[PDB]
Scaffold this motif. Sequence first.
Motif, PDB file in Angstrom:
ATOM      1  N   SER A  11       2.370   0.163   4.468  1.00  0.00           N
ATOM      2  CA  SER A  11       2.803   1.044   4.532  1.00  0.00           C
ATOM      3  C   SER A  11       4.132   2.048   4.460  1.00  0.00           C
ATOM      4  O   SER A  11       4.463   3.413   4.809  1.00  0.00           O
ATOM      5  N   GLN A  47       8.694  14.194  -1.155  1.00  0.00           N
ATOM      6  CA  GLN A  47       9.087  15.401  -0.540  1.00  0.00           C
ATOM      7  C   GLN A  47      11.179  15.827  -0.681  1.00  0.00           C
ATOM      8  O   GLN A  47      11.164  17.130  -0.703  1.00  0.00           O
ATOM      9  N   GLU A  48      11.397  14.556  -1.317  1.00  0.00           N
ATOM     10  CA  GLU A  48      12.884  14.762  -1.734  1.00  0.00           C
ATOM     11  C   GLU A  48      13.005  14.313  -3.198  1.00  0.00           C
ATOM     12  O   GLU A  48      14.047  13.324  -3.751  1.00  0.00           O
ATOM     13  N   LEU A  74      -5.222   3.381   6.501  1.00  0.00           N
ATOM     14  CA  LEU A  74      -4.297   2.035   5.155  1.00  0.00           C
ATOM     15  C   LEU A  74      -5.060   0.602   5.137  1.00  0.00           C
ATOM     16  O   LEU A  74      -5.372   0.643   4.018  1.00  0.00           O
ATOM     17  N   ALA A  92      15.859  17.820  -4.974  1.00  0.00           N
ATOM     18  CA  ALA A  92      17.163  17.757  -4.384  1.00  0.00           C
ATOM     19  C   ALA A  92      17.743  16.475  -4.128  1.00  0.00           C
ATOM     20  O   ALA A  92      19.026  16.538  -3.645  1.00  0.00           O
ATOM     21  N   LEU A  93      17.479  15.670  -5.174  1.00  0.00           N
ATOM     22  CA  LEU A  93      18.540  14.314  -5.364  1.00  0.00           C
ATOM     23  C   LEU A  93      18.701  14.011  -6.796  1.00  0.00           C
ATOM     24  O   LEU A  93      18.576  12.688  -7.267  1.00  0.00           O
ATOM     25  N   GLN A 115       6.788   8.853   0.714  1.00  0.00           N
ATOM     26  CA  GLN A 115       6.115  10.413   0.863  1.00  0.00           C
ATOM     27  C   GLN A 115       7.547  10.727   0.939  1.00  0.00           C
ATOM     28  O   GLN A 115       7.842  11.573   1.171  1.00  0.00           O
ATOM     29  N   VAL A 116       8.124  10.023   1.420  1.00  0.00           N
ATOM     30  CA  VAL A 116       9.362  10.877   1.673  1.00  0.00           C
ATOM     31  C   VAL A 116      10.376  10.353   0.031  1.00  0.00           C
ATOM     32  O   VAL A 116      11.158  11.680   0.403  1.00  0.00           O
ATOM     33  N   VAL A 176      14.112  14.990   6.964  1.00  0.00           N
ATOM     34  CA  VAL A 176      12.152  13.702   6.742  1.00  0.00           C
ATOM     35  C   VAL A 176      11.380  14.161   7.354  1.00  0.00           C
ATOM     36  O   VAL A 176      11.621  13.420   8.699  1.00  0.00           O
ATOM     37  N   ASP A 227      26.640  14.763  -1.809  1.00  0.00           N
ATOM     38  CA  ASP A 227      26.044  16.422  -1.806  1.00  0.00           C
ATOM     39  C   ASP A 227      26.854  17.214  -0.339  1.00  0.00           C
ATOM     40  O   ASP A 227      27.325  18.395  -0.951  1.00  0.00           O
ATOM     41  N   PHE A 238      -6.518  -0.749   1.888  1.00  0.00           N
ATOM     42  CA  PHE A 238      -6.150  -2.157   2.079  1.00  0.00           C
ATOM     43  C   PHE A 238      -6.950  -3.160   1.247  1.00  0.00           C
ATOM     44  O   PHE A 238      -7.308  -4.065   0.446  1.00  0.00           O
ATOM     45  N   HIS A 239      -8.089  -3.258   2.451  1.00  0.00           N
ATOM     46  CA  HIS A 239      -9.060  -4.728   2.213  1.00  0.00           C
ATOM     47  C   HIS A 239      -9.917  -3.946   1.059  1.00  0.00           C
ATOM     48  O   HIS A 239     -11.062  -4.864   0.207  1.00  0.00           O
ATOM     49  N   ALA A 256      -5.488 -11.307   9.438  1.00  0.00           N
ATOM     50  CA  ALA A 256      -6.239  -8.958   8.658  1.00  0.00           C
ATOM     51  C   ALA A 256      -4.652  -8.585   7.498  1.00  0.00           C
ATOM     52  O   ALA A 256      -4.623  -7.540   7.471  1.00  0.00           O
ATOM     53  N   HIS A 257      -3.999  -9.907   7.185  1.00  0.00           N
ATOM     54  CA  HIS A 257      -2.917  -9.356   6.251  1.00  0.00           C
ATOM     55  C   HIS A 257      -1.752  -7.953   6.487  1.00  0.00           C
ATOM     56  O   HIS A 257      -1.081  -7.297   6.417  1.00  0.00           O
ATOM     57  N   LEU A 258      -1.528  -8.617   8.648  1.00  0.00           N
ATOM     58  CA  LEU A 258      -0.650  -7.242   8.709  1.00  0.00           C
ATOM     59  C   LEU A 258       0.260  -7.400   7.905  1.00  0.00           C
ATOM     60  O   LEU A 258       1.209  -6.091   8.382  1.00  0.00           O
ATOM     61  N   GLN A 289       1.874  -8.390   4.609  1.00  0.00           N
ATOM     62  CA  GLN A 289       1.052  -6.670   3.623  1.00  0.00           C
ATOM     63  C   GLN A 289       0.632  -5.910   4.383  1.00  0.00           C
ATOM     64  O   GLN A 289       1.618  -4.611   3.140  1.00  0.00           O
ATOM     65  N   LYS A 290       0.189  -5.457   4.453  1.00  0.00           N
ATOM     66  CA  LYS A 290       0.027  -3.882   5.339  1.00  0.00           C
ATOM     67  C   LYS A 290       1.216  -2.889   5.967  1.00  0.00           C
ATOM     68  O   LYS A 290       1.118  -2.646   5.861  1.00  0.00           O
ATOM     69  N   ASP A 331       5.647   5.407   2.497  1.00  0.00           N
ATOM     70  CA  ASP A 331       5.791   6.195   3.090  1.00  0.00           C
ATOM     71  C   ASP A 331       7.326   6.611   3.621  1.00  0.00           C
ATOM     72  O   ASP A 331       7.573   7.810   2.572  1.00  0.00           O
TER      73      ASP A 331
END
Lengths: 45, 96, 48, 106, 94, 48
Positions: B71, B82-83, E53, B86-87, B78-79, E32, E26, E57-58, B62-64, B66-67, B75
Amino acid sequence: PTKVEAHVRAQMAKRQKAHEEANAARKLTAEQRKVKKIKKLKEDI
Amino acid sequence: LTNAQRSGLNQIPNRRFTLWWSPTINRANVYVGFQVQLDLTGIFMHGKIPTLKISLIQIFRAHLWQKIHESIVMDLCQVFDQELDALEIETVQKET
Amino acid sequence: TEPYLSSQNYGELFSNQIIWFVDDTNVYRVTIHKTFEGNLTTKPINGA
Amino acid sequence: EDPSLLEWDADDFRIFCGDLGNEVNDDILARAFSRFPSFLKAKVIRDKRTGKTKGYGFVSFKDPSDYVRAMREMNGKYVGSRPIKLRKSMWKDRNLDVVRKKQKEK
Amino acid sequence: EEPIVNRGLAAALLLCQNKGLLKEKDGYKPDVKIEYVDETGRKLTPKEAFRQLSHRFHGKGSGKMKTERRMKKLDEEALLKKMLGTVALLQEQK
Amino acid sequence: EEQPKQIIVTRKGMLDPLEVHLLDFPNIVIKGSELQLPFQACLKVEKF
RNA sequence: AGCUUUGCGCAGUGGCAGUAUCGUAGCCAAUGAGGUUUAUCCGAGGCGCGAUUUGCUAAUUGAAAACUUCCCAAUAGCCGUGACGACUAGUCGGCAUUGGCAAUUUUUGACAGUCUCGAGACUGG
């Protein structure tokens, strides 16, 4: 706890009532007993 | 169950054995390469190990692959959201 | 394996999360009754 | 509330057939069930923007006597290229699940 | 056994602890947090974070019945955790 | 709403069958007890 | 007319259900199955083989568990400032948005506990 078996109390009253309905019809009402007692006692002389 | 099903039920521990010793059996020193990449998965399979092919397909079903990559990408963005300041980042762009 | 209910963990018995105690010791119990001449009976009684 | 459920009902009974082959069966199902009894309406759910068949189909029969024999005979019967699986139609629309929610609290 | 003492906070801490409710870089600490949430804000199980997810995805989410079971499950948690002894005492009428 | 999510067994030979028989409820916690509670005293009172 | 017996059928309360309930088309069986007790007595099925529908609901994995979705843009109080306007550098009304709104007169809490017969007293060591 009284509510759920109060429902099922009404439903078992419905069930015993339906048993008494199926005994209430098919009962030899008042004179079907009389004609079956007659056909028991009156033979084929 | 049927004699063939009893055969397959007894070949199940060979499947878990092959999947267990997969990183040292499915290397290129062991089986000289006719490196067939597994389908929709980044695994190369040196040597036709069909028990390992079934086990690694059933892992990566089930395309793990690519998942996992999707992900990890999302993620990480997302990091980076979040930052952001400050970069000294204007924005991120999840590339097409 | 969860921390067994000690005398310093029993304070968690009384928060909002509903907890049960299952004491199954008294489920199967017997009475051992003698008459002197003859033999001896053991009656299984009801439990809880 | 989709405006398409109202083409079968005449208080007639619908059989639900699923596990059907999405490459075919658009009118193959009608062809197979038309022998019992006559002209009827049998649809196949082929979703739009794709033209692909979603599997399931609804065959609406005139009788629930006809229905029992049809169901028992054509259960798993080879139709197009997948054996059909047969169940009773839900039709859980608004006017019955409102009644179901009212029967929940009673 | 500890009362929340009027004019006092520390007895509530001794209550809740008893109840168990507790290049020239820095030069900095990037804290994180990698967190999976649904739209309601709930912290998401990794099995169902992978499920969200994979639905995205699908491109094809759940059916109607599994969404009914899942949504009714979430308000089962909501109705449970927002809280028959008094009814038992009132029936014990005999 | 009235099902527990934490179950404490007094006698230690019951949490392992409780693991098996409560796989329909994985939301519940089956821990043992270091403190045993005398519920045979409930048997000793005449009413129970 | 009432009571009642036996067999069968229906429904209902309860109980039991893998030394239980059956099928048997194979064979044997009241022209006798099977018998250690009581045998010039008892009398019913036995041996094998083979089994033990339907609806509803819960939970799990799975992307998907079978009855005709995600994302972007925009709309849905006061003190200053800018114009427009009105009235005599000042005042007022509405509009607009480019800083601020927890330190005695207000909107970031002198509140909380106690006691007495709608009214007062005590404490915050």
